[PDB]
Structure 1
Amino acid sequence: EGIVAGITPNIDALELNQDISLAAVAASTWGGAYGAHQPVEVIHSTYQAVHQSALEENYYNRLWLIPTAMELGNVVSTQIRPASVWNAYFSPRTLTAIDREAADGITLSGQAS
């Protein structure tokens, strides 16, 4: 009937600030498509296979990294900048840790470990 379309390399590697889009469904196969009823519609059902996808699954189901390069330039006073991460997973993505290298003097206030 229908098993898999693919599109695993493209979307995962596509120009996405997210990734692993529609990946949990791959393992969660299930399937009961076979079977037709008669609400006096018409007896038509042909092939019923897999093909293509949205093709625009962009920006789905993981963190974000808005900042990529910070132009601090000349620092002479206490500066404050925003850092945000957006997780679209249906389950949280816990950060393992923040290994601070040469980052002494940089602190986050109002946030946990």
Structure 2
Amino acid sequence: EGIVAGITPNIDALELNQDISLAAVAASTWGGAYGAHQPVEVIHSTYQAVHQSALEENYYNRLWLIPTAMELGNVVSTQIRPASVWNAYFSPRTLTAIDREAADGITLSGQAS
């Protein structure tokens, strides 16, 4: 009937500030499409296979990294900048840790571990 379309290399590696889009469904196969009823429709079901996809699954289901390169330039006073991350997973993505290297003097206030 229908099993898989693919599109695993494209979307996962595409120009997406997210990744692993529509990945959980791959293992979650299930399937009960076969079968037709007669609500006096006409009943014309042919082939019923898989093909292509939205092709625009962009920016779905993981963290974000808005800042890519910071131009601090000359630092002479206490500066404050925002850092944000957006998780689109239906389940949280817990950060393992923040290994601070040469980052002494940089602190985050109002946030837990």
Unaligned runs of 5+ in 2: none
Residues 2-35 of structure 1: CA deviation (Å, up to 9, x unaligned): 0000000000000000000000000000000000
User: How far off its partner does 1:71 sit?
Assistant: 0.1
Q: Secondary structure at the match of 1:12?
A: helix
Residues 71-110 of structure 1: CA deviation (Å, up to 9, x unaligned): 0000000000000000000000000000000000000000
Q: Normalized against structure 1, the TM-score is what?
A: 1.00
Measured in 2, the distance between the counterparts of 1:11 and 1:42 equals 38
Q: Secondary structure at the match of 2:104?
A: coil
Unaligned runs of 5+ in 1: none
User: How far off its partner does 1:46 sit?
Assistant: 0.1
Q: Runs ≥4 in structure 1, deviation > 6 angstroms?
A: none
Q: Percent identity?
A: 100
User: How far off its partner does 1:43 sit?
Assistant: 2.0
Measured in 2, the distance between the counterparts of 1:107 and 1:52 equals 47
Measured in 1, the distance between the counterparts of 2:18 and 2:43 equals 42
Measured in 2, the distance between the counterparts of 1:16 and 1:43 equals 41
User: How far off its partner does 1:56 sit?
Assistant: 0.2
Residues 23-53 of structure 1: CA deviation (Å, up to 9, x unaligned): 0000000000000000000021000000000
The reply on whether 1:52 has 2:76 as its aligned counterpart is no
Cα-Cα RMSD: 0.2
1:28-39 matches, cutoff 5 A: 28-39=28-39
Q: Secondary structure at the match of 2:11?
A: helix
Measured in 2, the distance between the counterparts of 1:107 and 1:63 equals 21
Q: What does residue 93 of structure 1 align with?
A: 93
